[PDB]
Amino acid sequence: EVETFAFQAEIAQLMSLIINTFYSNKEIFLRELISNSSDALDKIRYESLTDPSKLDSGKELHINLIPNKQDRTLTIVDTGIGMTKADLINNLGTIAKSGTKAFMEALQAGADISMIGQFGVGFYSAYLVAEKVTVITKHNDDEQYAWESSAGGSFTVRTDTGEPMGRGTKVILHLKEDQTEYLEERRIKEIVKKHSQFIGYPITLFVEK
Numbered sequence: 001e002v003e004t005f006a007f008q009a010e011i012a013q014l015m016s017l018i019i020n021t022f023y024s025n026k027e028i029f030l031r032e033l034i035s036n037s038s039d040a041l042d043k044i045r046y047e048s049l050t051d052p053s054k055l056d057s058g059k060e061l062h063i064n065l066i067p068n069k070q071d072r073t074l075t076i077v078d079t080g081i082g083m084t085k086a087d088l089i090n091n092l093g094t095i096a097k098s099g100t101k102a103f104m105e106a107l108q109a110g111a112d113i114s115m116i117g118q119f120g121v122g123f124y125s126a127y128l129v130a131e132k133v134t135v136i137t138k139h140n141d142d143e144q145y146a147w148e149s150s151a152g153g154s155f156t157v158r159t160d161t162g163e164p165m166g167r168g169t170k171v172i173l174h175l176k177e178d179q180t181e182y183l184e185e186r187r188i189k190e191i192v193k194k195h196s197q198f199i200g201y202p203i204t205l206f207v208e209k
């Protein structure tokens with residue numbers, strides 16, 4: 001069972017601005033996704049402070065970076081609070097309608113695309129380097145769902161029968177053919193050190209055979 005939804009107009013517009021605007025500093029995507037994972041890890045740590053059993057689905061709070069050269073995917077895994085189905089449909093838990101409005105007004109007033117995270121829609125920077133994005137997520141109060149979009153004005157949501165995650169969120173970036181540099185160990189490591197060096201969670205860069 002696969003449901004297909006239209007993006008709100010303002011979100012589709014933000015997505016095509018990100019895809020079409022000439023802008024060379026594409027590496028900020030990794031900082032924005034990592035920062036979103038860190039925010040979701042803060043959220044489940046804070047709930048665990050008064051209710052320990054919110055960690056029965058995973059005591060470990062971490063972020064993993066997993067490049068796969070055969071599939072041409074970069075996967076960002078976190079064991080944060082995760083997302084309910086309604087969250088996924090509602091622009092992946094963001095206020096994307098009003099953040100895009102403020103983001104685009106800023107762009108006309110001195111801002112550049114690298115400031116997208118200040119307006120809450122940093123996730124969509126994923127499309128600076130990905131032609132398709134898949135978000136697997138599991139929240140304590142809901143089942144495991146798969147969100148998927150290749151832009152073009154729509155996204156799908158389905159129940160994910162893949163590997164149980166326990167709790168957290170997985171962003172699979174199907175990279176564009178000319179963005180494979182973000183699969184290389186030394187290039188990911190440079191970006192993490194440049195932009196994410198004070199994230200309060202361990203970031204493990206997986207290696208490949």
Ligand SMILES: CN(C)Cc1cc(O)ccc1Br
Nearest residue numbers: 033036037040080092123169
């Ligand atoms: C924005 N990237 C990292 C996906 C994501 C992770 C979360 O932990 C929560 C929401 C989203 Br979308």
